[PDB]
Design a protein around this ligand. Structure first.
Ligand SMILES: CCCCCCCCCCCCCCCCCC(=O)OC[C@H](COP(=O)([O-])OCC(O)COP(=O)([O-])OC[C@@H](COC(=O)CCCCCCCCCCCCCCCCC)OC(=O)CCCCCCCCCCCCCCCCC)OC(=O)CCCCCCCCCCCCCCCCC
Ligand SMILES: CCCCCCCCCCCCCCCCCC(=O)OC[C@H](COP(=O)([O-])OCC(O)COP(=O)([O-])OC[C@@H](COC(=O)CCCCCCCCCCCCCCCCC)OC(=O)CCCCCCCCCCCCCCCCC)OC(=O)CCCCCCCCCCCCCCCCC
Ligand SMILES: CCCCCCCCCCCCCCCCC[C@@H](O)O[C@H](CO[C@H](O)CCCCCCCCCCCCCCC)COP(=O)(O)OCC[N+](C)(C)C
Ligand SMILES: CCCCCCCCCCCCCCCCC[C@@H](O)O[C@H](CO[C@H](O)CCCCCCCCCCCCCCC)COP(=O)(O)OCC[N+](C)(C)C
Ligand SMILES: CCCCCCCCCCCCCCCCC[C@@H](O)O[C@H](CO[C@H](O)CCCCCCCCCCCCCCC)COP(=O)(O)OCC[N+](C)(C)C
Ligand SMILES: CCCCCCCCCCCCCCCCC[C@@H](O)O[C@H](CO[C@H](O)CCCCCCCCCCCCCCC)COP(=O)(O)OCC[N+](C)(C)C
Ligand SMILES: CCCCCCCC/C=C\CCCCCCCC(=O)OC[C@H](COP(=O)(O)OCCN)OC(=O)CCCCCCC/C=C\CCCCCCCC
Ligand SMILES: CCCCCCCC/C=C\CCCCCCCC(=O)O[C@H](COC(=O)CCCCCCC/C=C/CCCCCCCC)COP(=O)(O)OCCN
Lengths: 98, 459, 140, 347, 70, 107, 54, 56, 121, 53
């Protein structure tokens, strides 16, 4: 497992950590999720191309399509939250509590 | 064994299909008939047991307990007939259903060839009693009393399930016959010590052992009369029966394991007897007397000698009957006064002479006057403890003296002296209450004629 | 990880009091740091400085507990000349509990700590002696 | 929404779960999870209000993060072995990542924080669906790879879930949060036996699903979401309160009720593997769940709370719609202990 | 009269107890053997139980692959 | 403070009802005299007449399944045999030592 | 009657158990509902699993 | 009057029916534990000329 | 145990063809009667919930509940018996095929076994 | 859990994409075709535990 895979895994870990921080701005949360899926796409594509496994050339396309659909769903949810409160601030979602 | 179980089950549809004004009569008649059927079980052999099937057996340790359990239900119905007069028919039927389910669970518990079935029924008895206590209870502390009663028992008995499944995984069986025939000694090990504790604590907490007896005064004071009767008569003896059944696999670990519990019981009988001297409530006094008697039964079971076992069985039966009668007398006073305080209603012998006679006989039986079976068990256990160690005689004598003291204190405070002037609603005692006391007391004096029927398998 | 566990366990019970105390201090410090991390994450009290003060307090308390437990247990095992005895762990464990009570400055927590830490330490020693497993492998 | 659209969305959720259950390719399992997540959001947001929107966005964030972690675990497994089949995981790091993703999907501790708030935000029907059906796919995936799980991590999160549910249920007055904490505790019970026997996991899942269906259907019948609102149920429909009390006693694990079956069998199986301490702690902790069940029963049926004058109109009307299988669910969650040896059917 | 109309002889209970004891002993021995068999099967994997799936070899393609060295 | 000082609409606590007032010879079983009398009769009969008497007589005349007189006769015949033959009554060993194979110590 | 039974025996098992369970319930259930802290704890938890169980 | 008191007194028959059914079930369950009938070493007996089973 | 991976097992068969070699459960089986009792209880609860005369509201509905419960219980009992038969068969086959792991214990009599005696005093 | 619908009906919904040595288009071989083929043939019908050992 060479250094390029380690760099991409580090990028995925950085994106996950940035998602789990939540300074503010749920839009940044969606951006971190999309960075994670982009890292997944890159690293899976490298694995598939390196080993000449012909039939998994489909899989990155499927992953991209599904993750972009999830992105659209999250964008719609963010828009509804913003229309409810006037902003996409994370701290405004405190109505439900443990 | 099904010739007893099936009629008890059929008691439910009969109760639920009865007329609105014929539930009590039918329930009492059929409960008395069921009790008559139970009498056949007493015939017992000096050999192994009455092994009816793979699921149920009977023994001369289980037979008196089964007879007492079957006999108690008509008395509980008679006692409950009064205070449930203004209750809807559905709720009265539900109360009778709870009593019948409790009897069925106890009956299946006492036969129980296999230990997990015993545990399942021994825990199934917990639900109807809890519903009775927390539903048909007069005061607002019934909820806290039910919580205490539930959680003490469950905390005690949860490790017992783990111990039992471990024992079956290792040995391979939990049938009592195989357990008895294939018994093996327990090595003095920490794991064996904790297995002993897990096997013993579940039955100790329900005796109740001194220091773990807190739930009993709450549950007994806050329960309705039928609940108090069953708790004092049968539910306390489940722990003793379980200890007698389970101490077969705890040897030779029991010789030194028993000391903490022996000391606790020997000092706690004195403690609770002394507590009985300063009590303002009849029910609390009777409950603490029950605690003292059950502590002495714990001593008997821990000594683990034939005389100990015979005395423990006799004392269990006698205490059940006596405590039930005392609770019934207290309830008769309470339904007139609505106070449950000793010092309020005084000099009741002048107003109710026959009930005063019942009080005197009940106090004499609790005092362990010879040749009652109470003293038979007391004396057998005292002799066994003396053989165990000659120094126990001091504590036993102190307990006897204090027991006589508070029994006669309870009699004198309520029956003698001058009547309270401002209390004028003390009506003559009904035939129902007198018959209840008579049916409590006559079996004791009949059983003292045939003590071998209640002396257990080691007779 | 399990490195701290190995460093503590490799030392014999009745020898090297200082090594056992140091290993116990390290384990306590790690536990306190983890608890402080959870406390900071779930509850940001007011600021960075007060948070680092909370972290330092928790870590020092846990490290002191561990150090006292290890030192007392090892000295008891050495002096009593009876190793592999749960009583030594009982005594050391609630010496640590009493130090917790002193640190929090209230007697009731100190007594409760002696009870519930001496029993816990004795149980751990008993499990080591008898081979009890907390996380059993799937045998069957 | 339109009933046609609602039926199509429910069918899509169920078809995603079935796609997870029947596929042997990791990509297809991921696709099933994505389809289930996609169709789940409108069901939660069916009754539009700010609370439902907040619950839906919290659920979406949690599930999207879990799906990303699961995809990463699949890719790492493929990297260290050119395999797509759901079998032995083949890698220590990949297994850890996958276990955390599935725990986040299930709501196991320490990933439990979203369950109570999502349950409180959504209605009772969405809560029923979320707490019953949304556990099948992750548990099936965990069962398929049970031979790869590290027992330490699984047992740690299981015990944590049991403790967290027991402690968090004590503090709640809202019924939906109580049900959520009960679900967390039951999940913790379910996942503590995966390293040893998956049949016990499936049996516990079936029993818990039946009990939860009975409880949620009873709560929907008597439209109460708070303790005090449920305290008014005796003045109109006491039979519902009595059945609810029996079901609550069953959910607390009290024998001889049905709820005693899973704990009994799990304890016995765990003892077969020379594990003693953990079952004892687990039962001790389930005592807390039983305690708050008893508090609910006290407030509901064993005592009579004060009522209001306007209940006299409610006395005159009957429920327009009757829920089928409510009677069957109550009986199955109450009286199936004698049929215990039927678990050999590999349920 | 009571023994005639209500009860039976000792041999009946004696032999019923013998049969019950035989059944229980057989069950206990079977339980021990079953636990031991489970342990052996899970430890070795050579038994019918605890068989975990492997890749089916019917999925492999055996044809020239545009390259002589596969 | 115009509050009514009433917490809620509650029925007054009813006064306890005497069974003797509306019906002397009340027997304390039921408020309906006929059901009351029949309850008294069935309780008294089925308890005292049936159980307390017939079951007591049944228990008194239970056959000896505990085998007491059988043991008496066995002991009597054994003591007759042993006194006559000079055997010393009871023997200290319950089992004959010929059939026990003790383990040799060789210490 | 008082000192032992009504006070100390009551303090030992039941009152102590109730107090400890109530305090733990308060600690566990006192969460403000902010996903900031929740996912920070998730990050902390994820790191611990990677470095402590392997 | 018959056909009227039955509608109120039909319930009385139930406990008694249960008893006879329980006796029948006890005998039926007894029938399944005959593996050692007349095979115990203590009560090993030769059958009577008109005896098929020592006990039922 | 885990029989999921057992050889020659069909993926979605409730009762395999080899299960038909076992005696079927009787129609008077106590477990079948308990299933019928469960169906009767379900019918009574259905009557009670809908606010109908519990005992005698719908006889056809109660009959349907009882019949469905009995039917499903019969099939469930068949499958359970088959599974336990498989368990015993595999156990005996494995014991037969591995003699070295299950040796015959040398039978020993109590007269020549020395067990420690612990007096009760 | 796992319901083997494909094996019951012989559908082959996703088995074509599981391994490198399974009928690639235009007979294009995987880089490690021979090694995976040998490993699969070794472990067929043996079970996971024995295959691993
Ligand atoms: C001694 C032998 C006696 C033989 C005669 C047979 C007597 C039959 C009695 C049957 C059992 C009694 C039932 C209890 C409730 C009483 C019913 C009632 O209300 O009476 C109303 C009735 C009508 O009066 P009333 O004016 O309408 O009512 C106004 C008030 O009630 C006011 O009424 P009161 O002021 O008159 O008081 C009521 C009276 C009645 O209430 C009682 O307290 C009587 C019960 C005392 C026993 C207390 C428990 C202690 C343990 C004893 C257990 C042994 C029982 C033996 C078998 C019994 C079989 C059932 O109480 C007393 O008189 C004081 C009793 C203290 C006696 C202490 C001595 C006891 C130990 C003696 C040894 C016994 C065996 C001897 C062994 C050695 C020799 C062979 O009065 C009576 O008939 C009195 C009953 C007779 C007195 C019994 C005294 C001794 C008998 C004990 C049992 C039999 C022993 C067998 C040996 C025979 C040789
Ligand atoms: C050990 C196993 C063996 C025994 C099994 C034990 C269980 C057996 C039954 C299981 C459930 C099935 C039936 C229950 C349906 C519920 C309906 C109901 O409530 O009863 C009303 C109904 C009478 O009322 P109704 O005039 O129709 O209309 C009134 C409305 O229903 C409503 O009236 P309302 O609304 O005006 O009154 C309100 C009342 C009404 O609310 C209720 O009563 C609800 C019912 C209780 C919940 C049931 C839970 C489901 C099963 C759980 C069983 C747990 C057992 C485990 C042990 C722990 C015990 C908790 O609620 C309250 O008062 C609130 C306070 C509640 C008090 C505390 C709650 C404790 C409940 C625990 C009960 C557990 C045992 C149930 C025994 C049967 C009870 C009916 O009762 C019946 O007539 C049906 C009972 C069974 C019929 C038997 C007929 C067959 C006999 C003829 C053939 C002979 C057979 C032998 C063949 C050979 C002979 C030739
Ligand atoms: C609260 C109200 C009453 C509730 C019920 C109380 C009853 C429970 C008490 C349990 C009985 C005793 C437990 C163990 C007895 C074994 C004997 C042992 O303790 O004595 C010495 C043991 O020495 C020391 O005691 C070691 C243990 C020290 C740690 C125990 C904590 C001491 C106080 C805890 C009491 C807390 C009870 C309540 C818990 C909530 C013997 O020395 P040793 O020869 O080496 O050990 C022999 C055993 N072997 C052979 C297996 C090795
Ligand atoms: C609350 C108690 C449970 C109730 C359950 C719901 C009751 C209604 C369900 C109606 C019947 C559903 C059965 C479906 C019909 C055919 C099933 C068959 O095709 O599938 C088989 C499977 O059969 C089912 O599993 C049996 C279901 C029977 C459930 C009853 C057991 C309940 C536990 C004991 C409690 C007693 C309940 C009795 C009253 C209902 C083959 O499975 P297989 O493809 O090879 O592998 C998948 C399973 N693995 C992975 C675990 C190995
Ligand atoms: C002078 C006489 C002195 C002695 C008096 C003795 C009176 C005895 C009364 C008490 C009887 C105790 C009940 C015994 C029931 C258990 C025994 C039961 O098993 O016997 C069954 C029979 O039970 C009896 O029929 C029960 C009789 C119950 C009724 C007793 C009479 C009083 C009832 C009053 C009812 C109310 C009357 C109506 C008033 C309005 C048949 O048993 P079975 O399995 O074959 O035994 C096998 C051995 N065999 C071969 C020898 C048979
Ligand atoms: C009120 C004023 C006085 C009027 C009355 C005057 C007459 C006085 C008589 C009253 C007592 C005086 C003593 C006389 C005793 C003689 C009777 C005695 O001999 O019979 C006893 C027999 O009594 C019974 O065995 C005991 C009674 C049975 C008790 C069972 C209770 C009934 C069931 C109720 C429910 C159970 C609740 C408790 C659960 C265990 C002992 O007999 P035993 O020497 O041995 O052998 C009997 C004969 N054999 C040899 C042929 C066998
Ligand atoms: C590790 C975890 C161990 C789990 C131990 C479980 C113990 C079982 C009971 C748990 C109850 C804890 C919750 C509690 O009681 O809170 C205090 C509660 C507050 O009242 P609320 O009803 O919540 O509010 C009223 C005002 N609106 O106070 C009470 O009511 C106390 C009354 C119940 C007392 C029950 C006694 C239980 C103790 C018995 C001894 C054994 C306990 C179990 C473990 C013992 C150790 C082996
Ligand atoms: C009224 C409240 C009372 C509550 C009960 C108090 C006592 C509880 C009993 C102890 C709990 C555990 C019971 C053990 C279950 C039986 C299993 C067994 O005996 O096997 C032992 C298991 O022994 C243990 O593991 C015990 C560990 C204890 C952990 C739980 C601690 C609970 C509290 C303990 C202290 C309190 C006990 C007494 C309480 C006094 C009353 C309050 C050996 O295990 P193996 O590893 O297979 O064999 C060894 C050879 N390899």
């Amino acid at each position: 497992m060479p250094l390029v895979y380690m760099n991409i895994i580090m990028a995925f870990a950085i994106a996950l950590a940035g998602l789990l921080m939540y300074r503010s701005h749920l839009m940044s949360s969606l951006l971190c999720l999309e960075g994670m899926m982009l890292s997944l796409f890159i690293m899976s594509t490298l694995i598939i191309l390196n080993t000449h496994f012909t039939l998994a050339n489909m899989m990155p396309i499927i992953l991209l399509v599904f993750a972009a659909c999830e992105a659209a769903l999250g964008l719609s949810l963010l828009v509804m939250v913003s229309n409810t409160y006037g902003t996409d601030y994370v701290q405004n979602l405190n109505l439900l509590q443990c | 064994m099904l010739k007893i179980i099936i009629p008890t089950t059929m008691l439910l549809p009969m109760t639920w299909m009865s007329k609105h004004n014929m539930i009590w009569i039918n329930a009492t008649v059929h409960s008395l008939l069921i009790s008559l059927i139970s009498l056949s079980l007493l015939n017992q052999l000096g050999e192994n047991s009455l092994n009816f099937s793979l699921t149920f057996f009977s023994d001369s340790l289980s037979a008196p307990l089964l007879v007492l359990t079957t006999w108690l239900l008509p008395l509980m119905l008679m006692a409950s007939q009064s205070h449930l007069s203004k209750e809807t028919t559905t709720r009265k039927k539900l109360y009778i259903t709870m009593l019948i389910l409790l009897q069925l669970f106890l009956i299946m518990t006492f036969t129980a060839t296999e230990l997990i079935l015993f545990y399942i029924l021994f825990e199934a008895t917990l639900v109807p009693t809890l519903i009775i206590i927390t539903r048909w209870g007069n005061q607002t502390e019934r909820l806290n009393a039910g919580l205490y009663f539930l959680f003490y028992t469950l905390a005690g008995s949860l490790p017992l399930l783990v111990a039992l499944v471990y024992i079956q995984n290792t040995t391979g069986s939990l049938n009592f016959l195989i357990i008895h025939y294939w018994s093996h000694p327990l090595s003095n090990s920490w794991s064996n010590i904790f297995m002993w504790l897990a096997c013993i604590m579940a039955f100790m907490v329900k005796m109740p052992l001194y220091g773990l007896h807190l739930w009993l005064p709450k549950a007994h004071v806050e329960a309705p009369i039928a609940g108090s009767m069953v708790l004092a008569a049968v539910l306390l003896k489940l722990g003793g029966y379980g200890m007698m059944r389970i101490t077969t696999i705890l040897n030779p670990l029991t010789n030194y394991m028993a000391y903490p519990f022996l000391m606790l019981s020997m000092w706690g009988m004195i403690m609770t007897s002394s507590i009985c001297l300063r009590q303002t409530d009849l029910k609390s006094l009777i409950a603490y007397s029950s605690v003292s008697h059950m502590a002495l039964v714990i001593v008997a079971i821990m000594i683990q000698t034939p005389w100990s076992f015979m005395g423990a069985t006799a004392l269990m039966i006698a205490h059940g009957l006596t405590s039930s009668m005392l609770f019934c007398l207290a309830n008769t006073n309470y339904e007139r006064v609505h106070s449950r305080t000793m010092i309020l209603a005084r000099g009741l012998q002048t107003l109710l002479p026959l009930m005063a006679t019942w009080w005197l006989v009940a106090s004499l039986t609790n005092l362990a006057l010879p040749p009652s079976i109470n003293l038979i068990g007391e004396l057998f256990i005292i002799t066994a403890s003396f053989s165990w160690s000659n120094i126990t005689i001091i504590l036993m004598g102190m307990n006897m003296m204090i027991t006589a003291l508070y029994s006669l204190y309870m009699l004198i405070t309520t029956q003698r002296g001058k009547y309270t002037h401002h209390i004028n609603n003390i009506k003559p005692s009904f035939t129902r209450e007198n018959a209840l006391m008579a049916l409590h007391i006559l079996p004791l004096l009949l059983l003292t004629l045939n003590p071998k029927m209640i002396l257990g398998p080691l007779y | 990880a399990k490195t701290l566990l190995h460093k503590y366990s490799d030392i014999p019970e009745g020898t090297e009091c200082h090594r056992k105390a140091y290993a116990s201090t390290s384990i306590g410090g790690a536990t306190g740091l983890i608890v402080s991390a959870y406390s900071i994450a779930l509850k940001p009290p007011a600021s960075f400085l007060e948070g680092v003060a909370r972290t330092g307090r928790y870590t020092f308390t846990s490290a002191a507990i561990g150090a006292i437990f290890g030192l007392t247990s090892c000295i008891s095992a050495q002096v009593r000349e009876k190793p592999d005895d749960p009583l030594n762990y009982f005594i050391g464990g609630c010496a640590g509990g009493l130090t917790l009570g002193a640190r929090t400055r209230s007697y009731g927590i100190g007594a409760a700590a002696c009870a519930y830490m001496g029993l816990t330490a004795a149980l751990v020693k008993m499990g080591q002696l008898e081979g009890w497993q907390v996380f059993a492998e799937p045998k069957v | 929404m339109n009933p046609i659209i609602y039926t199509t969305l429910i069918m899509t959720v169920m078809s995603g779960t079935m796609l997870v259950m029947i596929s042997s390719h990791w990509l297809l399992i991921w696709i099933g999870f994505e389809m289930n997540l996609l169709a789940m959001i409108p069901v939660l947001m069916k009754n539009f209000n700010p609370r439902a929107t907040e619950a839906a966005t919290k659920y979406f964030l949690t599930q999207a993060t879990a799906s990303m972690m699961l995809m990463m675990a699949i890719i790492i497994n493929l990297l260290y072995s050119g395999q797509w089949t759901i079998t032995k995981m083949f890698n220590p790091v990949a297994m850890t990542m996958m276990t955390m993703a599935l725990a986040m999907k299930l709501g196991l501790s320490p990933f439990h924080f979203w369950v109570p708030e999502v349950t409180q935000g959504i209605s009772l029907q969405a809560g029923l669906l979320l707490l019953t059906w949304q556990k099948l796919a992750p548990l099936s995936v965990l069962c398929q790879i049970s031979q790869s799980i590290n027992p330490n991590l699984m047992l740690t999160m299981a015990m944590l879930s049991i403790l967290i549910g027991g402690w968090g249920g004590l503090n709640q007055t809202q019924l939906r949060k109580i049900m959520a904490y009960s679900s967390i505790a039951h999940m913790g019970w379910m996942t503590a036996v995966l390293p040893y026997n998956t049949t016990m996991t499936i049996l516990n899942l079936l029993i818990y699903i039946t009990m939860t269906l009975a409880m949620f259907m009873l709560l929907i019948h008597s439209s109460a979401t708070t303790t005090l609102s449920l305290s008014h149920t005796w003045n109109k429909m006491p039979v519902i309160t009595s059945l609810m009390m029996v079901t609550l006693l069953s959910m607390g694990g009290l024998p001889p009720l049905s709820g005693f079956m899973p704990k009994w069998m799990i304890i016995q199986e765990m003892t077969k593997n020379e594990s003693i301490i953990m079952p004892t702690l687990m039962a001790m902790t389930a005592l807390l769940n039983l305690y708050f069940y008893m508090r609910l029963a006290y407030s509901s049926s064993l005592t009579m709370f004060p009522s209001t004058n306007n209940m006299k109109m409610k006395w005159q009307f009957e429920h327009t719609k009757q829920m089928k299988l409510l009677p069957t669910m109550i009986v199955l969650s109450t009286l199936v202990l004698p049929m215990t040896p039927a678990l050999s059917s590999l349920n | 009269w009571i023994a005639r109309t209500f009860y039976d002889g000792p041999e009946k209970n004696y032999e019923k107890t013998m049969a019950i004891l035989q059944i229980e002993a057989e069950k206990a021995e079977l339980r021990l053997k079953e636990l031991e068999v489970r342990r052996l099967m899970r430890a070795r994997g050579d038994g019918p139980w605890y068989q975990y799936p492997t890749i089916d070899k019917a999925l492999i393609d055996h044809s020239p692959k545009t390259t002589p060295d596969n | 403070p115009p509050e009514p000082t009433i917490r809620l609409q509650e029925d007054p606590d009813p006064e306890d009802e005497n069974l003797y007032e509306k019906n002397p010879d009340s027997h304390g079983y039921d408020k309906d005299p006929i059901v009351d009398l029949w309850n008294m009769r069935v309780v008294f009969f089925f308890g005292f007449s049936i159980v307390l008497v017939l079951g007591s007589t049944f228990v008194a005349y239970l056959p000896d399944y505990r085998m007491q007189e059988w043991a008496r006769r066995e002991a009597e015949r054994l003591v007759k045999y042993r006194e006559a033959n000079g055997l010393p009554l009871m023997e200290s060993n319950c089992f004959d030592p010929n059939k026990i194979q003790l383990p040799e110590d060789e210490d | 009657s008082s000192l032992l039974d009504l006070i100390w025996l009551e303090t030992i098992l039941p009152k102590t158990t109730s107090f400890i369970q109530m305090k733990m319930s308060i600690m566990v259930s006192n969460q403000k509902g902010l996903i900031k802290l929740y996912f920070l704890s998730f990050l902390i938890t994820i790191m611990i699993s990677m470095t402590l169980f392997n | 009057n018959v056909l009227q008191i039955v509608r109120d007194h039909w319930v009385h028959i139930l406990v008694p029916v249960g008893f006879v059914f329980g006796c029948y079930l006890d005998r039926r369950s007894d029938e399944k534990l005959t593996a050692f009938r007349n095979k115990s070493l203590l009560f090993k007996r030769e059958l009577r000329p008109n005896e098929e089973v020592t006990w039922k | 145990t885990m029989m999921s991976g057992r050889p020659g097992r069909v993926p979605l068969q409730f009762l395999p063809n080899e299960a038909r070699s076992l005696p079927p459960p009787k129609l008077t089986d106590p477990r079948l009667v308990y299933m019928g009792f469960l169906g009767y209880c379900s019918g009574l609860i259905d009557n009670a919930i809908r606010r109908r005369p519990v005992v005698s509201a719908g006889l056809h509905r109660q009959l349907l509940y009882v019949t469905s419960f009995v039917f499903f219980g019969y099939y469930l009992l068949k499958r359970q018996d088959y599974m336990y038969a498989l368990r015993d068969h595999d156990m005996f086959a494995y014991v037969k095929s591995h003699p070295e792991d299950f040796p015959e214990k040398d039978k020993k009599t109590y007269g020549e076994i020395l067990e420690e005696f612990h007096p009760v005093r | 859990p796992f319901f083997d619908v494909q094996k019951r009906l012989g559908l082959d919904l996703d088995r074509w994409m599981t391994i490198q040595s399974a009928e690639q288009p235009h007979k294009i071989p995987g880089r490690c075709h021979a090694f995976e083929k040998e490993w699969i043939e070794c472990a067929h019908g043996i079970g996971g535990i024995r295959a691993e050992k």
